[PDB]
Amino acid sequence: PKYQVRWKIIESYEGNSYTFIDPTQLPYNEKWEFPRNNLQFGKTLGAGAFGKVVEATAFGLGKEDAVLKVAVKMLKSTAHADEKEALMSELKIMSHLGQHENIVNLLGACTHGGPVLVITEYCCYGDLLNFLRRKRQLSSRDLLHFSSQVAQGMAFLASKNCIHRDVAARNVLLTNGHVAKIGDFGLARDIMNDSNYIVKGARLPVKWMAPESIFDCVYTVQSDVWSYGILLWEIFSLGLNPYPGILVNSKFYKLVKDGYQMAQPAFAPKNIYSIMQACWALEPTHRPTFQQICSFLQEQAQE
Ligand SMILES: Cc1cc(-c2c(-c3ccccc3)c3cc(Cl)ccc3[nH]c2=O)on1
C-alpha cells in the first residue's frame, strides 16, 4: 500500500485560471512554520495505515494570537522517505491553493524540530456522512446548504486547476454553525479495511469514481463533478451507501458504463435530483461545472 496524495494540480489553459507552476515540484514556503512547542496534543481524531491526525490546541496561531483547537496531520515512525515526501507534496499543494471557507484549510506546519506536522483546521461536528446517519431534526434546507457549500469549495479547487479525485460525504467535515468543508481525510481513515476502496493491485473509491476514471485512469475536474453527484445522493439518501445492495464487480462496471444511474433518493427534490443526473452524464463535456451547479443551487432562491 502506497500513501499517494489524492489532490493534484493539473495544467489547464482555456480555463479561467492558468497554471504557471506546479507547487509540488519545488516550493517550501517557510511562512507556515509554527513552534511545535506551542501545540498541545489532544486525543487522536483518527488514524490509518500511514499515520494519524490528532486534536490539539495552538497557542498564538496567525497574526491575531488566537488559541484555537486544531487538527494535526502527522505520520507514524514506521514512515520512510517516500511517505515523508508525499506528506510535503500535500502541504505545498495546500500552501498554493490558498484559503477558502468551504475547504479544510492549512494553518501551519512544523518542518523543523523533528517530525513534520501539518496543522489544519478543526471542525467540531465531524464528517457529513456520520452526521446524516445520526440525524435521520434535519430540514430539507439543511441538506440543500451542504450541497451548495460543498459545491462552492469544489468550485474553488476547480478555480486553481486542482482535482480532488475522492469526493464523498466521508471527506466533508462540518465546522461551526454546521458549515461544510471538503478535504481529504486519507490519513485519518484506515483504507486497508474500508470496503468502499477496492483494490487495484491501490485503493480507489470506485462507486464514486467517474466511468472515465475507472476504465481509462483519467482524472479531470469533470471526473470530480460526477463523484460530486454521488455525494448529493448520499446527502439526500441521508447517508445510504451508493448503489445499495449492488456489489462492486464485473457486473457493476458494465452497469455504470451502460448509463445506469441510482434511483432518486427519498428526500431529493426533483430539480436537485436533476443535478445528479447531469453530474452523472456519460460524457465529461456534458456534465456541468461546479460553478454552474453552484449558481443553480442558488437559483433555488425560491425560499
Ligand atoms: C470526529 C471528528 C473528526 C474531525 C476532523 C478530522 C477527521 C478525523 C478522522 C476522520 C475524519 C476526519 C480531520 C482530518 C484531517 Cl486529515 C484534517 C483535519 C481534520 N479536522 C477535524 O476536525 O473532527 N471531529
Describe the protein in words.
It is classed as transferase. Keywords: Receptor Tyrosine Kinase, Kinase-Inhibitor complex, transferase. The assembly is monomeric. A hairpin with a 7-residue loop joins β5 (106-109) and β6 (117-120). The chain has two domains: 19-122, 2-Layer Sandwich (Phosphorylase Kinase, domain 1), CATH 3.30.200.20; 123-297, Orthogonal Bundle (Transferase(Phosphotransferase), domain 1). The protein has a five-stranded antiparallel sheet, with helices on one face. Strands 1-7 form a two-stranded antiparallel sheet. Strands 8-9 form a two-stranded antiparallel ribbon. α3 (140-158) packs antiparallel against α5 (221-236). The chain is of the alpha+beta class and 303 residues long. The chain has helices at residues 81-97, 128-132, 140-158, 211-216, 221-236, 250-257, 270-279, 290-299, and strands spanning 8-9, 39-48, 51-58, 69-75, 106-109, 117-120, 162-163, 198-199, 203-204. The structure holds the ligand Cc1cc(-c2c(-c3ccccc3)c3cc(Cl)ccc3[nH]c2=O)on1. Residues 45-46, 53, 71, 73, 104, 120, 122-123, 126-127, 173, 185, 187-189 line the site of the ligand Cc1cc(-c2c(-c3ccccc3)c3cc(Cl)ccc3[nH]c2=O)on1. The ligand Cc1cc(-c2c(-c3ccccc3)c3cc(Cl)ccc3[nH]c2=O)on1 binds at residues 45-46, 53, 71, 73, 104, 120, 122-123, 126-127, 173, 185, 187-189.
